[PDB]
Amino acid sequence: SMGDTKEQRILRYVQQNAKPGDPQSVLEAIDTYCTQKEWAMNVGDAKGQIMDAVIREYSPSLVLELGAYCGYSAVRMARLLQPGARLLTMEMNPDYAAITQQMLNFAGLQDKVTILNGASQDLIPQLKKKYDVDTLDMVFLDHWKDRYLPDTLLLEKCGLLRKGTVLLADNVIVPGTPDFLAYVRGSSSFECTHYSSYLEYMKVVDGLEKAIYQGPS
């Protein structure tokens, strides 16, 4: 880092307003700061509640997140994981990864979440043999939108999905992931559900796609 950034200001706002070890207060602080002061690409409170419902329904034991940013969604999912369950979050921006680690420490979720430093297209094919992953129980896609489809394909080709694995994809309407949608909605290897919501901190309509893997063809 070379100066003050939006992401550093978000982290400072958490550290000055939230309660350490209280994930809810961390999420409220980030949402308050980004509603009142600086828009940011956190998944946000409205879409977060859909995320909350998915986590509580499927109780995943191992979650992979693509795109950590400041750690909002990592904190948001990890606080609802069952004891022993784990979240891996991939982040290629080292400055963001350092912020995310500080957010996890502050929220008290550092023992449940591991930051993988690097790009998803490089790390996903290495998950089985470098990070000892068998299969993933849930995947949250929220990185650059042109990577949703090839990384989904990569998750499939690398044998990281099993029957019942949950793919939850942010931003499928805005900025929009039409190619990802057409793939998962048109493949009999996925059962899809679209969740109406709003772009974080705005009243532009957005949505999440839940795509449940059904096993190989």
Ligand X SMILES: C[S@@+](CC[C@H](N)C(=O)[O-])C[C@H]1O[C@@H](n2cnc3c(N)ncnc32)[C@H](O)[C@@H]1O
Query: Active-site residue numbers?
Result: 142, 145, 170-171, 200
User: Judged by CB under 6 A, which stretch of 5-13, 92-100, 185-193, 195-203 contacts ligand DNI?
Assistant: 195-203
Binding site for ligand X (CB under 6 A): 41-43, 67-69, 72-73, 90-93, 96, 119-121, 142-144, 147
Q: Do 26 and 14 meet the contact criterion of CB atoms below 8 Å apart?
A: yes
73 marked ligand binding residue: yes
Closest distance to Na ion from the beta carbon of 80 (Å): 13
> What binding mask, one character per residue, do residues 121-160 give for Mg ion by CB under 5 A, x or -?
---------------------x------------------
Which residues have a Cβ under 8 Å from the Cβ of 53 and sit 6 or more positions away? Answer: none
- Which runs of E-coded beta strand occur in the chain? 62-66, 86-91, 113-117, 136-141, 161-169, 190-198, 205-213
Closer to Mg ion by CB, 20 or 53: give it: 53
Residue-level length of the chain: 217
Let me know: does 113 contact 119? Beta carbons within 8 Å: no
What pairs with residue 141 in β-bridges? 66, 169
Q: Please tell me whether 189 is known to bind a ligand.
A: no
- Least distance from C-beta 144 to ligand DNI, angstroms? 6
Q: Are 138 and 55 in contact (CB under 8 A)?
A: yes
Q: Which of residues 173-192 bind ligand DNI (CB under 6 A)?
A: 174-175
Q: What string marks each residue from 29 to 48 as x (binds Cl ion by CB under 5 A) or -? A: ---------------xxx--
Separation CA 44–CA 165 (nearest Å): 23
Judge whether 191 is annotated as a binding position: no
Q: Is 17 annotated as belonging to a binding site? A: no
